[PDB]
Design an enzyme around this catalytic site. Structure first.
Site, PDB file in Angstrom:
ATOM      1  N   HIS A   1     -10.714  -6.637  -0.050  1.00 39.72           N
ATOM      2  CA  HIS A   1     -10.801  -5.200  -0.031  1.00 39.72           C
ATOM      3  C   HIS A   1      -9.670  -4.538   0.717  1.00 39.72           C
ATOM      4  O   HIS A   1      -9.336  -3.394   0.442  1.00 39.72           O
ATOM      5  CB  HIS A   1     -12.115  -4.755   0.590  1.00 39.72           C
TER       6      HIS A   1
ATOM      7  N   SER B   1      -9.815   2.700  -1.543  1.00 41.09           N
ATOM      8  CA  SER B   1     -11.251   2.911  -1.507  1.00 41.09           C
ATOM      9  C   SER B   1     -11.553   4.384  -1.659  1.00 41.09           C
ATOM     10  O   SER B   1     -10.986   5.043  -2.520  1.00 41.09           O
ATOM     11  CB  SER B   1     -11.839   2.348  -0.200  1.00 41.09           C
TER      12      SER B   1
ATOM     13  N   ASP C   1     -11.639  -8.686  -3.813  1.00 42.84           N
ATOM     14  CA  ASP C   1     -12.305  -7.620  -3.116  1.00 42.84           C
ATOM     15  C   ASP C   1     -13.792  -7.869  -3.346  1.00 42.84           C
ATOM     16  O   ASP C   1     -14.246  -7.989  -4.486  1.00 42.84           O
ATOM     17  CB  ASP C   1     -11.872  -6.300  -3.737  1.00 42.84           C
TER      18      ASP C   1
END
Length: 255
Positions: free
Chosen positions: A236, A79, A208
Site C-alpha cells: 500500500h 489512497s 497492496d
C-alpha cells in the site's frame, strides 16, 4: 524540462510518507511539493475542527492556487489522496498536466463523490481494518467519522513490504483521519468537463493488501486512465516499499 510534482498522502498519514520519493524526484532535476492535508502530518489543525472534505483538502488547493500562470503540476495521489486530486482536477483542470493515482480510488465523474466508497465498502469485508478504530465527532446532528490506523493493520496491510523503520515512523506519526463520507455525500460531484478533462494515470501496487490490486484494476477498468504502470512488489505504501519504482513510473508517466 523540469516538472513540478505535487504529492498527496492518503488518510491518517502525512507528507512525510514522501520522504524517500521526494529526494529521488529532486535528484532527477524536478520540483516537488509534498503537502500535509489538514490535521495530517504536522499540519497544525485538529481533526475535530475539520468537518468538510474541502477544508481537509485546503492545503492542496492552496498549492494549486499558487501554480503560476504558465506552469502546470503533475499530481500524485496516494489512497484517499486521490479524492483531493479529484477536487484539484475539478477546480484547476488547466493547471495539471497529469493526475496520477496510486493505490487510490480514482473518482468517477459519472457518479457521486461517495460512489467509490460505497463500492469499496461493498467489495471489502467489514473487518478489513483489523485493530483500527472509528469514532464519530463533530456535529451530533450530522456527525463526522474519524479513524485511527491500528498498528497491526499498518504492519500487515499497509507497510508489510516496507522496512521496520518505515513502519516505526508510521506508528510514531499517524494521526486520526476521516473520509468525510457524510460531507462527500452532499458535495457536488466532479464533472467530465472539468475533472474529466485532466489526463489520468494509474500506478498499480500489486501487493497492496489494503486496497487490493483487483480493486485498483476495477477502478482503472470502470473509470479509465490514459497511462497505467505497475509496481509488482509495492504494498500500500509504494513510495516507501518501492520509492525508486514510484519515481521511475512517475517520470515515465510525466515525460
Amino acid at each position: 524540462q523540469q516538472k513540478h510534482f505535487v504529492l498527496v498522502h492518503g488518510g491518517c498519514l502525512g507528507a512525510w510518507i514522501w520522504y524517500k520519493l521526494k529526494p529521488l524526484l529532486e535528484s532527477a532535476g524536478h520540483k516537488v511539493t509534498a503537502v500535509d492535508l489538514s490535521a495530517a502530518g504536522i499540519n497544525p489543525r485538529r481533526l475535530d475542527e475539520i468537518h468538510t472534505f474541502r477544508d481537509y483538502s485546503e492545503p492542496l488547493m492552496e498549492v494549486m492556487a499558487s501554480i503560476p500562470p504558465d506552469e502546470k503540476v503533475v499530481l500524485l495521489g496516494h489512497s484517499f489522496g486521490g479524492m483531493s486530486l479529484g477536487l484539484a482536477m475539478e477546480t484547476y483542470p488547466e493547471k495539471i498536466s497529469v493526475a496520477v493515482f496510486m493505490s487510490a480510488m480514482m473518482p468517477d465523474p459519472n457518479h457521486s463523490l461517495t460512489y467509490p466508497f460505497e463500492k469499496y465498502n461493498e467489495k471489502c469485508p467489514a473487518d478489513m481494518m483489523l485493530d483500527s478504530q472509528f469514532s464519530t465527532y463533530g456535529n451530533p446532528e450530522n456527525p463526522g467519522m474519524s479513524m485511527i490506523l491500528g498498528p497491526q493493520f499498518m504492519a500487515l496491510k499497509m507497510f508489510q513490504n516496507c522496512s521496520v523503520e518505515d513502519l516505526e515512523l508510521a506508528k510514531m506519526l499517524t494521526r486520526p483521519g476521516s473520509l468525510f463520507f457524510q460531507d462527500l455525500a452532499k458535495a457536488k460531484k466532479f464533472s467530465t468537463e472539468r475533472y474529466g478533462s485532466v489526463k489520468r494515470a494509474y500506478i498499480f501496487c500489486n501487493e497492496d493488501k489494503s486496497f487490493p490490486v483487483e480493486f485498483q484494476k476495477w477502478f482503472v477498468e470502470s473509470v479509465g486512465a490514459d497511462k497505467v504502470k505497475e509496481i509488482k512488489e509495492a504494498d500500500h505504501m509504494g513510495m516507501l516499499s518501492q520509492p525508486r519504482e514510484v519515481c521511475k513510473c512517475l517520470l515515465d508517466i510525466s515525460d
